[PDB]
Design a protein around this ligand. Sequence first.
Ligand SMILES: *[C@H]1[C@@H](C#N)C(=O)[C@@H](C)[C@@H]2CCc3cnc(Nc4ccccc4)nc3[C@@]12c1cccc(C(=O)O)c1
Ligand SMILES: *[C@H]1[C@@H](C#N)C(=O)[C@@H](C)[C@@H]2CCc3cnc(Nc4ccccc4)nc3[C@@]12c1cccc(C(=O)O)c1
Ligand SMILES: [Ca+2]
Ligand SMILES: [Ca+2]
Lengths: 416, 416
Amino acid sequence: KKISGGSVVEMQGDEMTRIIWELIKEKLIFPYVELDLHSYDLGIENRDATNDQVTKDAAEAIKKHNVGVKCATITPDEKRVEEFKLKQMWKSPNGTIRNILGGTVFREAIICKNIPRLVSGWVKPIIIGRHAYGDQYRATDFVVPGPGKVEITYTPSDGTQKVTYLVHNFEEGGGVAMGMYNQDKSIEDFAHSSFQMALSKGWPLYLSTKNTILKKYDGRFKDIFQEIYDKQYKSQFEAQKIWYEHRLIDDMVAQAMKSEGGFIWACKNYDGDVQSDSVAQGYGSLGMMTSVLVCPDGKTVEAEAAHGTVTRHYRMYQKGQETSTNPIASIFAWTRGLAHRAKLDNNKELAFFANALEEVSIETIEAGFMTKDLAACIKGLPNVQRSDYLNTFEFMDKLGENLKIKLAQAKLSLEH
Amino acid sequence: KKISGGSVVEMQGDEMTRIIWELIKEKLIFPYVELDLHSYDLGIENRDATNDQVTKDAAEAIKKHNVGVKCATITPDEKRVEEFKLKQMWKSPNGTIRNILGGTVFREAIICKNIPRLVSGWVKPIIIGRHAYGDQYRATDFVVPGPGKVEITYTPSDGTQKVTYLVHNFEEGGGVAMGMYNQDKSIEDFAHSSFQMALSKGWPLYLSTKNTILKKYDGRFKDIFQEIYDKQYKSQFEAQKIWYEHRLIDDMVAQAMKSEGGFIWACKNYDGDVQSDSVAQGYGSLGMMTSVLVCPDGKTVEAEAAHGTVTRHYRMYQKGQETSTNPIASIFAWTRGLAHRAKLDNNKELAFFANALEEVSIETIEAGFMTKDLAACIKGLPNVQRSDYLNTFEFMDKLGENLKIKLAQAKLSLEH
Ligand SMILES: *[C@H]1[C@@H](C#N)C(=O)[C@@H](C)[C@@H]2CCc3cnc(Nc4ccccc4)nc3[C@@]12c1cccc(C(=O)O)c1
Ligand SMILES: *[C@H]1[C@@H](C#N)C(=O)[C@@H](C)[C@@H]2CCc3cnc(Nc4ccccc4)nc3[C@@]12c1cccc(C(=O)O)c1
Ligand SMILES: [Ca+2]
Ligand SMILES: [Ca+2]
């Protein structure tokens, strides 16, 4: 009776989102879908136990099976090293997976009509296309302990030349230094994914850089997008009455703030990280956002919950206190992954299921059933009473009941 | 009868802002204040003629005289090189001045009660403390033409070692690479200015970094601020019922978006540039913002108009067409510079004048007299008629009339 779901790579995560991830599988996915599930535990304890090998194994499994669904994980700092008794301050697992797979992370707010926007003018959606490779996420940074020279060198593989640039001569005291890079092929794939997303939505595209300051580094992103546009997409954009334009990043954030939305925003890795959280919050709620890595092969995706592990709710949970955490982004990581799986397999039943679960999630919140964090968006936290929201278990039960109803009606809807 | 103003370094700029700068001096400053004015023409034609030496000379004059007032300038790209027949694609003059002087650029919206905010919740101001030195603004960036290695090396001056790190081995094709740095003393000065700004306003302070990704580079900023706070400011913050907290940049931008304002935000150089424009736009208008570099000596400042040169209005001006450009940020660069000059010289007359001109500027707009760009914030550009605004000359005349009145009444309010 269960839908034959196919092959999916799942990555378990940390703290509150790890608890929610299990509730999602048990209450919303497993009762209706049978999967060939390849499970990787990306919990901080397991990454520590495997010396972060589990992260690389999960990335390789996504390349093989073409669809990954990831739970929010901890990127450890000094406090986490103390808390979990870690061997090393492990690198971000999202950075590791994105650097192995490459591509563009597409992010968009999840809209509920009853959640007020913080930016009045935003009547149409904004889609951010965050370049998922290189820059700060594959950088080499270090503390400069004292006086001395920091230089950056380039040596072509033919061995016939060497270029050395002085970064800084630390004359007195120390500081910090770093090197970072990006690859032309990765930038070209980011450009193609951005232009294709704009044509698919029928919306204009904007790329943001600071090419007036980083004339070579950001200039390369600006030049690659302009060349690909002029040679491969200008006529298709003109036919659809849309356009592509480059903007300086500081100008772009201000223009986005005063716009009515309805555009694709190509962001470099760091800007995509920052501005996707600004835009998600602007639409009403930080936790109400989809995030899907679209790989350059045009076949592989990794859907994820881009927010944190909700440590404050997890601490309350550990103390036996009632908690009320928004599971919607975690649900949409599953639905977006399952919708892609269904498209690859031409599986109509799975495609219907993935869409129905998204509809149920939105319909439940719009009917006034939600978690404390969302109820606070509507009423303001000092005005929220216990009767205004459902705890995490009650909310998951309500979604499960509504999903069973939607699926039962869809089965009855079928012409004999 | 004119106020004895003292020594001020002025830096002339480009296009529409250059015209406005002259109108400000002629109509608002020179009729009331006599200055020992050290003028540097930072117009693109003069920077080209002097091989950018005028920019360095202006920075040295600010170190000497302690107060600079700067007009908006062009940072040239490929199109500007063609337009002005430039010898070189000159570096940002703001970057050059800030790197020579060092310090923190404090940015805050200029509030007019009749200009609608785009972010409803912002009932109190937000002050951004942008670290003015290093990072992207003093980086070495370059195109990687093909396969080869990019490495970053540290050679201690005490010659005890040499550390070489691989940034990237380009195996196929090329891309881009860059080295950047920061200095411990500059970060320490940025921390002191941020804590002192917070204690001065009686508001909490937040520092944003991405230390989970750049563990050493951003970790150093986080550690320096924490050590300075724990040892020198914590008890003072507790006494004023305020606090200091570090936030990850993506979390911070979302937190800022949903807050009610009323905090100091310590931003690294790049974040300060991006977020200052996002925040200025959020308050209602990009062009309504003050920007004052506060140098580490605690005596030197450089006030500036942080927005663009308004090329579109300049093109209309060149064609003999009527224009209506907001001169307020350019006016506040003068009033903030003159107010600092007055504080250094204990000149009550100049301090009174600088404050009166700021009051006149706000009172004029709040009374419904403004330029087309501000009238469009209230009505929407398609609804703006000629009767809704004053052209640039009419607006400057209105301000001049209101300033003459305010000053005349202040003189009459005096007791024998
Ligand atoms: C959750 C909640 C419960 N139960 C609380 O009582 C308060 C203490 C906390 C504070 C911190 C926090 C953080 N994040 C969330 N929710 C979230 C889910 C998914 C993605 C991102 C965030 N919730 C809380 C929580 C809270 C409840 C109500 C209002 C707020 C708020 O800060 O507006 C937070
Ligand atoms: C100004 C104006 C006049 N006179 C116009 O007719 C239109 C065409 C333009 C477009 C470009 C532009 C750019 N910047 C400004 N103002 C500004 C001043 C100081 C700092 C930043 C910006 N004004 C214009 C102008 C305009 C008028 C009305 C509304 C807008 C708008 O884009 O919202 C722009
Ligand atoms: Ca993020
Ligand atoms: Ca800027």
